């Protein structure tokens, strides 16, 4: 079973390490702090079944923030299209994507 001594005698042992959105030294933010915050606030106190049936969009957004799969597919498709269009040579890249554009600062 799951004995909750920490909730019984009111002493923290490992609650701080448990989640990524918890308090950390010098308040250093994670990559997906807001997504995890919204997912936890969606899935608090309502049960795991209703959390996985009702807050699926927030958890999917958090998983996409963690893994970055759709961004990988989008960028790979864009780069493959650039390689193809440079193969048949219909379009040429602009000077601002080659390193000779007098960068902003």
């Amino acid at each position: 079973p799951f004995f909750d001594v920490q909730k019984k005698l009111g002493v923290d042992l490992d609650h701080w390490m448990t989640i990524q959105s918890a308090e950390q030294p010098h308040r250093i933010p994670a990559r997906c702090h807001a997504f995890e915050k919204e997912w936890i606030e969606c899935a608090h106190g309502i049960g795991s079944i209703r959390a996985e049936k009702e807050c699926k969009i927030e958890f999917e957004d958090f998983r996409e923030c963690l893994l970055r799969q759709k961004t990988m597919k989008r960028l790979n498709a864009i780069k493959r299209q650039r390689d193809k269009l440079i193969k048949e040579g219909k379009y040429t890249p602009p000077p601002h994507h080659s390193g000779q554009e007098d960068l902003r600062p």
Binding site: P1, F3, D14, M17, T18, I19, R63, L66
Partner: protein, 347 residues
Amino acid sequence: MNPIILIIILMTVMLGTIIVMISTHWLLIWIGFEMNMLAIIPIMMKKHNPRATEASTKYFLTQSTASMLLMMAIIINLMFSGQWTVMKLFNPMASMLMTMALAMKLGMAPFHFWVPEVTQGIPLSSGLILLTWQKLAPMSVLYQILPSINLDLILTLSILSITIGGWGGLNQTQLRKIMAYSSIAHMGWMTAVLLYNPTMTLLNLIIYIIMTSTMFTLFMANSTTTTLSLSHTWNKAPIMTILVLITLLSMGGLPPLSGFMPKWMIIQEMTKNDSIILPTLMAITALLNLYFYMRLTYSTALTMFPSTNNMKMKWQFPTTKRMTLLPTMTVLSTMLLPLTPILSILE
């Protein structure tokens, strides 16, 4: 065997198991598992004989492989979830790896291949510890991960463990190998019911712990390790023969004894979820268990095996061993049936 060192080692084992019980982080679960196995290694090297070294080597290799699988599951869960609460996993591979990691830890067939060997090569106190207290922590781990447990894998492991344990205990004549295969069969029996109602799992775990403790306490009290000395014990104390007979009757789930309490009620949670063939199959394998149990009681008390001449000196000396908690655990393993709904305290 310094008593201070033994006390500290036992406290370390208790601390590791309770760290598995009371923590809320996967790293602390693994911490408790590692400290538990590290402090249980000297328990199986108590007598300092090479068979104990063989058994401890096999045990360490299997437990370390299971622990490495456990980190594989934890790191995969971290990748797919980004959080560390001990709850339902967020990946099917994490659940699969965790399930066979805990099956390797608990000696569930076909990962049971270390259980009948290691228990054969260690002293009876270490065998009692391994077959009673070691099973507690991964039961808690499996209880806390039950939403994400795949049904097919745990059911296949349960039926394979029950069948293999019964068929492997059907042949052995040593007491420790029979105990090991009986433990395997009981493990499969109480992991088959886990996904439907874990209160039945906890009740069967408590009943099996009490009954195995009674069996091992009787074996250390009679100083018997094989079938023949357990047959020979009837010259020394017939009341111990009566006690081992009644608790082996209880061990096969024959009413009106305590061993009929869990499994029958396990069937009470099989037909609720519309499953009929499964409790019948596990009941037939429990009948196999009862067959080699009946063989043990035929060898022990229901007959009168021929003895040797030296029993007479053993009739001039009472049992000086510290027979601790034998009557209470013997009574609690035989006449607990009319207090069946006490399982409600395990909710």
